[PDB]
Design an enzyme around this catalytic site. Structure first.
Site, mmCIF file in Angstrom:
data_model
loop_
_atom_site.group_PDB
_atom_site.id
_atom_site.type_symbol
_atom_site.label_atom_id
_atom_site.label_comp_id
_atom_site.label_asym_id
_atom_site.label_seq_id
_atom_site.Cartn_x
_atom_site.Cartn_y
_atom_site.Cartn_z
ATOM 1 N N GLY A 1 5.468 38.607 17.446
ATOM 2 C CA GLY A 1 4.574 38.707 16.305
ATOM 3 C C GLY A 1 4.282 40.094 15.774
ATOM 4 O O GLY A 1 4.020 40.255 14.583
ATOM 5 N N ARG B 1 -5.309 40.784 22.697
ATOM 6 C CA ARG B 1 -4.163 40.970 21.815
ATOM 7 C C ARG B 1 -3.979 39.759 20.907
ATOM 8 O O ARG B 1 -4.051 38.613 21.356
ATOM 9 C CB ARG B 1 -2.882 41.191 22.622
ATOM 10 C CG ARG B 1 -1.653 41.401 21.748
ATOM 11 C CD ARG B 1 -0.454 40.607 22.246
ATOM 12 N NE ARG B 1 -0.391 39.267 21.670
ATOM 13 C CZ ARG B 1 0.562 38.847 20.842
ATOM 14 N NH1 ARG B 1 1.544 39.663 20.482
ATOM 15 N NH2 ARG B 1 0.535 37.606 20.378
ATOM 16 N N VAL B 2 -3.737 40.025 19.627
ATOM 17 C CA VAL B 2 -3.536 38.969 18.645
ATOM 18 C C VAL B 2 -2.186 39.156 17.961
ATOM 19 O O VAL B 2 -1.841 40.264 17.549
ATOM 20 C CB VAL B 2 -4.656 38.983 17.577
ATOM 21 C CG1 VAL B 2 -4.266 38.108 16.393
ATOM 22 C CG2 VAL B 2 -5.962 38.495 18.193
ATOM 23 N N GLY B 3 -1.428 38.070 17.846
ATOM 24 C CA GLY B 3 -0.121 38.138 17.218
ATOM 25 C C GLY B 3 -0.125 37.810 15.736
ATOM 26 O O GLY B 3 -1.135 37.980 15.051
ATOM 27 N N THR C 1 5.193 29.131 21.134
ATOM 28 C CA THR C 1 4.788 29.144 19.700
ATOM 29 C C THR C 1 5.489 28.043 18.920
ATOM 30 O O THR C 1 6.688 27.813 19.095
ATOM 31 C CB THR C 1 5.144 30.485 19.019
ATOM 32 O OG1 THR C 1 4.567 31.571 19.754
ATOM 33 C CG2 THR C 1 4.618 30.513 17.589
ATOM 34 N N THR D 1 8.132 32.892 14.284
ATOM 35 C CA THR D 1 7.928 32.828 15.725
ATOM 36 C C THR D 1 8.545 34.073 16.364
ATOM 37 O O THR D 1 9.236 34.843 15.694
ATOM 38 C CB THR D 1 8.588 31.567 16.321
ATOM 39 O OG1 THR D 1 8.227 31.443 17.702
ATOM 40 C CG2 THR D 1 10.103 31.649 16.199
ATOM 41 N N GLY D 2 8.294 34.271 17.655
ATOM 42 C CA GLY D 2 8.842 35.428 18.345
ATOM 43 C C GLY D 2 7.846 36.562 18.493
ATOM 44 O O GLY D 2 6.638 36.329 18.544
#
Lengths: 144, 140, 138, 143
Positions: free
Chosen positions: D55, D29-31, D1, D52-53
């Site tokens: 989500g 899957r969506v962050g 990311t 970031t990280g």
């Protein structure tokens, strides 16, 4: 689209939001309904709110989170809804867009059972159900 | 403190409020009240803006979107999901039985079917007809 | 004020910043700067966390998520998109050439291709192998 | 990311967030990266922020929108990033989770060109390029 927020007898909050989206929209288009902080946001420490209007406008303004956050800043549910709209009203104008072509509103609820409702334009309505019964109510609006 | 209390968007919310009250008025969870409340509007084919009977995209597909938030910061959402009449319930499954919070497209439908949710035809005849009538005056 | 100035995440953000600066230092718009910068990491297959070279989902599919936002609340985004190396550009395309702000799944790729974006295999033999290795344990 | 935010010579802000999501995630899957207010948010009147990280926790608290709103209240970029991750650590404990498996980073910038960052676990750095040069800094320091 239907947004619902509730405060149970335990004093807990919760919300639901489900829609089919804008009719005949592009394939794969997503509105505000499923986005946390856009179509709906809940914080059992501050309160909750759910939106109404063009999903595109609610997403860019992260309105629902804005309302809850404003309630976290001392604003009552109504002041938070009004303050949020007036802020988005400025954002809209900044974009050179006419207030008549864009609608964005919210209905909020806090830990004390206090609620609010406000929109850019008139014409919207919502439902409230407490120990006083079930009733249709109209919110406040900026365009007037 | 005014509680319990339910707030719903638009006119159909009055009927959705009654369903949620049955739960809230008996000291039920707010999560179960809001889920059941909106589910009624999802099951209603006459309400073409939510779930079953909803107006599809230009391609004629009915893709639903939904998210849910409880009292303990738990969240769940699904976007662009089809063939599942109750997207708000599938969103609750994502929140409860998934290490994630948002699913979209087929993957969202895959998890749904994996949880026992049944495949259904959300596109009503009326919605299908009006869409075909749109295509004409739309030139798409 | 300290302008122009750009900020990006992680160590690879340093090299990506250089591509953004090329636009900033010349007085270019922030929107074009933040696009050219993150794109550098999208095309890099050695950075398996962004675009090309990215690790796939449990199914072995590489789905990308990206969104952009300018100085006047104009937004653009795409989620769960496949075969497109630069989702950040597709998001901008959705922002400028579409009445919507967010597209996902097939609808994202469809629109993307309709805009001249090429279809490529974002799964590198290295990511595909690391994936299969993971499948064993889970 | 990779999340990126900047302020040009005109004094305009903009952001960009792109990623391939959590490795081996569930198909669709969506962050937080594609969500405005979550993985990214910009307000030319106040500033910009990107994260970031994991989500899931960023979508959970609409982090980025919170960071900017905090800066709106008067907090410094670093302070906003700090307060945001704090709210996250609180919700993590509240939900009965272990902060050890969680990593979230925020980088913020305001209209005056002031910047800052913060995160949950050691190991996250950010790159900053200004008229003085291009370098790598460790969140929580400076200010």
């Amino acid at each position: 689209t239907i947004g619902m927020i509730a405060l149970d007898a335990q004093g807990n909050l919760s919300g639901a939001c489900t829609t089919s989206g804008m009719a005949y929209k592009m394939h794969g288009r997503v509105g505000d309904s499923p986005i946390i902080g856009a179509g709906l946001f809940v914080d059992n420490e501050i309160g909750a709110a759910t939106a109404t209007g063009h999903g595109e406008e609610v997403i860019r303004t992260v309105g629902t989170h804005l309302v809850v956050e404003l309630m976290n800043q001392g604003r009552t549910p109504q002041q938070a809804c009004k303050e949020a709209v007036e802020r988005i009203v400025k954002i809209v104008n900044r974009r050179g867009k006419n207030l008549k072509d864009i609608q964005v509103g919210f209905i909020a609820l806090n830990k004390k059972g206090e609620y609010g409702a406000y929109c850019i334009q008139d014409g919207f309505n919502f439902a409230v159900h407490d120990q006083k019964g079930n009733r249709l109510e109209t919110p406040g609006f900026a365009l007037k | 403190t005014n509680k319990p209390i339910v707030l719903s968007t638009w006119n159909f919310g009055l009927h959705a409020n009654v369903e949620a009250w049955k739960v809230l008025s008996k000291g039920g969870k707010a999560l179960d009240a809001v889920e059941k409340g909106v589910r009624l509007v999802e099951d209603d084919p006459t309400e073409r803006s939510v779930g079953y009977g909803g107006r599809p995209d230009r391609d004629g597909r009915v893709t639903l979107d939904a998210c849910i938030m409880d009292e303990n910061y738990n969240i769940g959402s699904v976007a662009c999901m089809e063939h599942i009449k109750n997207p708000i319930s599938v969103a609750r499954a994502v929140m409860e039985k998934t290490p994630h919070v948002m699913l979209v497209g087929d993957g969202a439908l895959e998890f749904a079917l994996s949880q026992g949710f049944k495949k259904e035809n959300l596109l009503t005849a009326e919605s299908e007809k009006e869409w075909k009538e749109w295509l004409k005056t739309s030139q798409y």
